[PDB]
Amino acid sequence: GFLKLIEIENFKSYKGRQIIGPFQRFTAIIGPNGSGKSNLMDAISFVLGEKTSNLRVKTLRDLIHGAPVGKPAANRAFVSMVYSEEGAEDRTFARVIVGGSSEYKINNKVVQLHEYSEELEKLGILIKARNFLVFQGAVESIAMKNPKERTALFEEISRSGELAQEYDKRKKEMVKAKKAKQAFEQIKKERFDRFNACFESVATNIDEIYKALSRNSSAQAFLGPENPEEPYLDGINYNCVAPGKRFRPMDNLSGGEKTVAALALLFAIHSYKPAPFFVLDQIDAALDNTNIGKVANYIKEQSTCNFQAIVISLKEEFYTKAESLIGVYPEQGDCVISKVLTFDLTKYPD
Amino acid sequence: GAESISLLELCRNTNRKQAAAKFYSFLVLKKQQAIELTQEEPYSDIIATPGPRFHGSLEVLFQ
């Protein structure tokens, strides 16, 4: 499972027809301050089916290069992705802007969005959950979550939170024919099971993730509900044995160890419904020299087996661990123009 | 033609960090218009030629 190559024509700052990549197991997108790096992330969201309203433009045609300043470069634009799967031939997923409509194609076969997303979902790519993407600030956001805020996060990702209405509604019918109880225990078990189908997987994985991020067997990490019988009703506790430290809660961890533990939680949650590739947008922003190389090598190790890593990074200590660099640079022009270079880092020692 | 510097030649005997730093300098110098860039195919050599905001020696610029 491998995003091999992205092709772009006239999409936001990527003027003209450009080839992005090929991508390697661990590829870093880098470059000086400019619009191009974040436009490439939007290109990936776009080709995986993201709604216009989630791409910070008001109209689909606003994604065509130059259309913001009333000079679109064409009536068409596109992003395509070549996707490779072991044992299968390559498939190209393309989304073309044709006037005001999208046109979706799998190997130049025109399909509706429903079928396009169905085929991506069979690959583990979930546009509704954005499982393939870690946005800026996601580490700092997860580090700030309290036990009850984690529970709501688990209620959402597990689709148990959509049973919260029928839950206390059947409890209402039960508080007042000793059979509405069994109707309530019925919906109680369904919410519990959907919750634990997700949560027990996440809780199982987090220890090994925390160990690999810490590069230390002495580290360990524990997830568990305050309310084991009905986890969704109360908070989720998160305790770590940080290397060379006592067994402590997360919300009491040292500033640097805390981000590593938030990272372990972040990754453990994505381990639940993982994508075959992971676009990490400045996931190293909250890192410092305590933990930058450890996390970079974790990504490096994970990239060989568990997921293709595509990282957008401003920090050399992080991105010099990638196999490939895609450098983004600006061209002078009417509007911002982005172009890319590719650089093979594996040719150099260290 | 004009003076031209090969990034892959510049990176002989460098480690990953130094090689990445030279690659990044091409992006910065192109942004500053001190050079122009050409790459023929993905992962082929990257060639820097003069840009309009630098008139010195490219060889000296990348020493």
Side-chain angles (χ1 to χ4, degrees), chain A residues 1-224:
Chain A
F2 189 63
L3 201 172
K4 183 185 283 188
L5 190 75
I6 283 163
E7 193 166 349
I8 301 197
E9 190 175 3
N10 282 325
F11 181 85
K12 309 194 87 174
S13 66
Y14 290 93
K15 174 185 194 170
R17 198 185 192 107
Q18 309 195 25
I19 283 136
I20 308 306
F23 290 83
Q24 300 293 319
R25 296 301 297 177
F26 184 7
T27 295
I29 298 158
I30 69 164
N33 178 41
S35 307
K37 298 204 287 310
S38 79
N39 288 356
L40 190 52
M41 197 177 59
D42 296 344
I44 292 161
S45 290
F46 175 79
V47 75
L48 301 180
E50 187 62 273
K51 297 170 184 173
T52 290
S53 53
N54 295 327
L55 292 166
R56 304 172 325 279
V57 292
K58 299 198 225 68
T59 77
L60 180 77
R61 290 203 47 91
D62 283 336
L63 298 168
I64 299 184
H65 176 74
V69 298
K71 292 194 286 177
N75 181 263
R76 307 173 107 250
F78 78 90
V79 185
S80 69
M81 161 190 73
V82 175
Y83 184 78
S84 177
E85 188 164 50
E86 173 173 343
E89 309 177 25
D90 287 350
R91 306 156 81 201
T92 58
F93 289 75
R95 187 186 177 171
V96 186
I97 305 177
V98 183
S101 300
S102 283
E103 170 178 88
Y104 304 89
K105 295 189 294 185
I106 309 170
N107 290 330
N108 265 312
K109 167 199 175 182
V110 173
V111 301
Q112 296 302 330
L113 179 55
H114 186 271
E115 175 178 0
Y116 192 83
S117 297
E118 179 175 34
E119 291 297 319
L120 290 170
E121 174 185 352
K122 294 172 181 178
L123 300 175
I125 305 154
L126 304 175
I127 189 51
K128 283 154 202 61
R130 284 177 276 284
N131 63 335
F132 59 89
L133 179 53
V134 177
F135 291 104
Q136 296 179 33
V139 175
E140 189 178 346
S141 168
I142 196 69
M144 281 309 300
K145 278 187 168 40
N146 62 35
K148 195 179 183 186
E149 281 166 333
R150 308 194 185 107
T151 298
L153 181 56
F154 281 101
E155 281 249 61
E156 187 67 86
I157 305 170
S158 64
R159 292 175 184 175
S160 69
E162 80 195 11
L163 273 53
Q165 250 197 18
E166 184 69 9
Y167 177 75
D168 39 38
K169 281 179 180 182
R170 295 194 186 188
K171 186 205 308 297
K172 201 193 309 179
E173 305 174 11
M174 184 227 171
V175 172
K176 315 191 214 301
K178 271 147 61 183
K179 112 160 311 168
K181 177 180 90 174
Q182 292 179 323
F184 165 73
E185 286 166 340
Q186 208 79 0
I187 198 67
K188 180 223 293 298
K189 170 178 168 55
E190 198 198 323
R191 188 181 190 190
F192 171 100
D193 284 343
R194 286 184 174 200
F195 190 98
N196 279 348
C198 164
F199 175 87
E200 291 174 344
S201 239
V202 172
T204 306
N205 301 341
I206 190 166
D207 177 70
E208 196 180 336
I209 297 168
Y210 188 61
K211 278 184 163 54
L213 283 165
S214 293
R215 325 208 70 68
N216 182 17
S217 311
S218 160
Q220 40 189 329
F222 298 93
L223 278 178

Side-chain angles (χ1 to χ4, degrees), chain A residues 5 19 21-24 27 30-34 300 316-317 319-332 340-350, chain B residues 7-24 26-33 36-47 52-53:
Chain A
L5 190 75
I19 283 136
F23 290 83
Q24 300 293 319
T27 295
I30 69 164
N33 178 41
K300 188 189 171 168
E316 57 163 29
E317 279 308 308
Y319 63 69
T320 55
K321 316 287 159 66
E323 303 159 88
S324 267
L325 301 184
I326 297 175
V328 181
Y329 64 91
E331 290 270 30
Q332 310 305 313
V340 308
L341 308 168
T342 40
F343 191 68
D344 181 351
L345 291 173
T346 67
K347 296 163 71 160
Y348 312 99
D350 284 31
Chain B
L7 176 66
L8 288 178
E9 295 186 349
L10 280 187
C11 291
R12 280 187 39 178
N13 307 114
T14 66
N15 61 48
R16 275 171 173 249
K17 167 168 175 164
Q18 305 164 323
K22 296 194 164 178
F23 174 68
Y24 193 78
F26 275 40
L27 313 168
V28 169
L29 287 169
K30 168 65 185 174
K31 170 170 174 185
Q32 303 175 323
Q33 299 185 74
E36 301 192 27
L37 301 163
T38 293
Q39 182 173 30
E40 196 82 328
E41 296 274 303
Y43 303 97
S44 66
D45 199 9
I46 300 161
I47 309 291
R53 292 196 187 176

Side-chain angles (χ1 to χ4, degrees), chain A residues 143 150 210 214 219-221 238-264:
Chain A
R150 308 194 185 107
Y210 188 61
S214 293
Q220 40 189 329
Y238 187 16
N239 289 277
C240 315
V241 171
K245 297 262 128 54
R246 284 306 316 246
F247 172 94
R248 294 143 65 205
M250 213 251 281
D251 198 18
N252 299 89
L253 238 48
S254 188
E257 281 172 346
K258 189 172 183 175
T259 64
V260 181
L263 255 174

